[PDB]
Amino acid sequence: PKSFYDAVGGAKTFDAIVSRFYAQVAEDEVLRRVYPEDDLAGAEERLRMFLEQYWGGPRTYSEQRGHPRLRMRHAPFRISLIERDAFLRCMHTAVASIDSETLDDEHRRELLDYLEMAAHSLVNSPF
Amino acid sequence: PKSFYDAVGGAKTFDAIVSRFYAQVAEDEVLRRVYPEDDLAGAEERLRMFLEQYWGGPRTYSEQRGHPRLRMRHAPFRISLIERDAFLRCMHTAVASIDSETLDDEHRRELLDYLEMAAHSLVNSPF
Numbered sequence: 136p137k138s139f140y141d142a143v144g145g146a147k148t149f150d151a152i153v154s155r156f157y158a159q160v161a162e163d164e165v166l167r168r169v170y171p172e173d174d175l176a177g178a179e180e181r182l183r184m185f186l187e188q189y190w191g192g193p194r195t196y197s198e199q200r201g202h203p204r205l206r207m208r209h210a211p212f213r214i215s216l217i218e219r220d221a222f223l224r225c226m227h228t229a230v231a232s233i234d235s236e237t238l239d240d241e242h243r244r245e246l247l248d249y250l251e252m253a254a255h256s257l258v259n260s261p262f
Numbered sequence: 263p264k265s266f267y268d269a270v271g272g273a274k275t276f277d278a279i280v281s282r283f284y285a286q287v288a289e290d291e292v293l294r295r296v297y298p299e300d301d302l303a304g305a306e307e308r309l310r311m312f313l314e315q316y317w318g319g320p321r322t323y324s325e326q327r328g329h330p331r332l333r334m335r336h337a338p339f340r341i342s343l344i345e346r347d348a349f350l351r352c353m354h355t356a357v358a359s360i361d362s363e364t365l366d367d368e369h370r371r372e373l374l375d376y377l378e379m380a381a382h383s384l385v386n387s388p389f
């Protein structure tokens with residue numbers, strides 16, 4: 136359980152978190168207006184691959200997508216405080232669906248602190 | 263009293279390590295987009311000078327560049343865990359290419375531990 140990725144249960148956990156997140160996005164009145172496709176399967180795959188690589192897992196994200204330029208990839212979309220908050224709600228819901236044996240208090244806090252900081256940093260629009 | 267630098271084979275060892283590192287960088291989906299495409303020779307040379315000096319070799323780095331100030335020198339770049347991990351991956355490959363006669367287990371571990379700690383200290387961005 137060296138890497139954060141391995142410590143929290145690896146592929147199975149990230150699939151669990153991101154699938155639950157994207158299931159929430161699908162119903163989300165705020166986020167549905169911003170995610171461009173009806174079929175959110177691609178978006179879910181890419182976010183999952185990114186998070187898996189970020190926390191020390193497989194490098195499939197950069198193999199398929201190249202270098203992470205996260206600001207430029209969000210630039211087409213108007214992400215104001217309102218979208219940021221909806222994103223964080225869906226993530227908090229997804230993370231709360233994971234049990235504490237799998238995701239212990241320390242790793243849970245660390246992941247949540249990361250997602251909070253990252254989402255604030257991606258706000259790119261006043262409205 | 264023998265320096266780490268001389269113990270590990272001095273200039274030839276550091277040249278091999280940094281040269282191989284830069285060759286891995288060029289094949290790395292993450293890092294090839296980060297290092298300066300038009301300044302790779304000079305960049306390779308600065309890293310070699312730095313490492314040679316850090317480990318007790320020539321102090322040419324400080325004469326030419328002053329105090330390392332690595333945080334400020336990496337400030338122009340968004341280094342997240344993604345870039346940290348890619349750097350260490352490339353560095354691990356370069357270091358592994360050096361034989362254990364030249365670079366024995368004790369010196370190998372000390373070099374790797376340094377690179378690990380230093381790469382972590384240069385993380386400056388969430389993505």
Ligand code: HEM
Binds near residue numbers: 169177185389
């Ligand atoms: C701040 C609230 C956010 C909103 C509203 C948002 C929305 C979006 C949208 C609409 C896309 C394009 C979806 C598509 O491909 O069809 C996208 C892509 C992406 N997002 Fe977010 N996002 C947010 C925050 C984040 C955060 C915090 C992260 C990771 C830390 C993240 C990681 C990614 C990644 C990796 C992609 C795909 C990049 C690629 O093209 O490879 N996003 N996001």
Ligand code: HEM
Binds near residue numbers: 301308346380
């Ligand atoms: C953490 C991941 C890292 C990334 C993405 C990264 C990337 C870069 C880049 C793009 C440059 C500019 C190259 C140039 O034009 O000189 C640079 C410079 C440099 N890096 Fe790194 N680096 C990382 C870690 C490290 C580490 C761990 C060390 C310590 C061994 C280091 C030592 C240096 C030195 C000495 C320079 C040149 C400074 C100068 O201009 O005098 N870097 N780095």
Ligand SMILES: [C-]#N
Binds near residue numbers: 182
């Ligand atoms: C972004 N999801």
Ligand SMILES: [C-]#N
Binds near residue numbers: 309
């Ligand atoms: C820095 N290389």
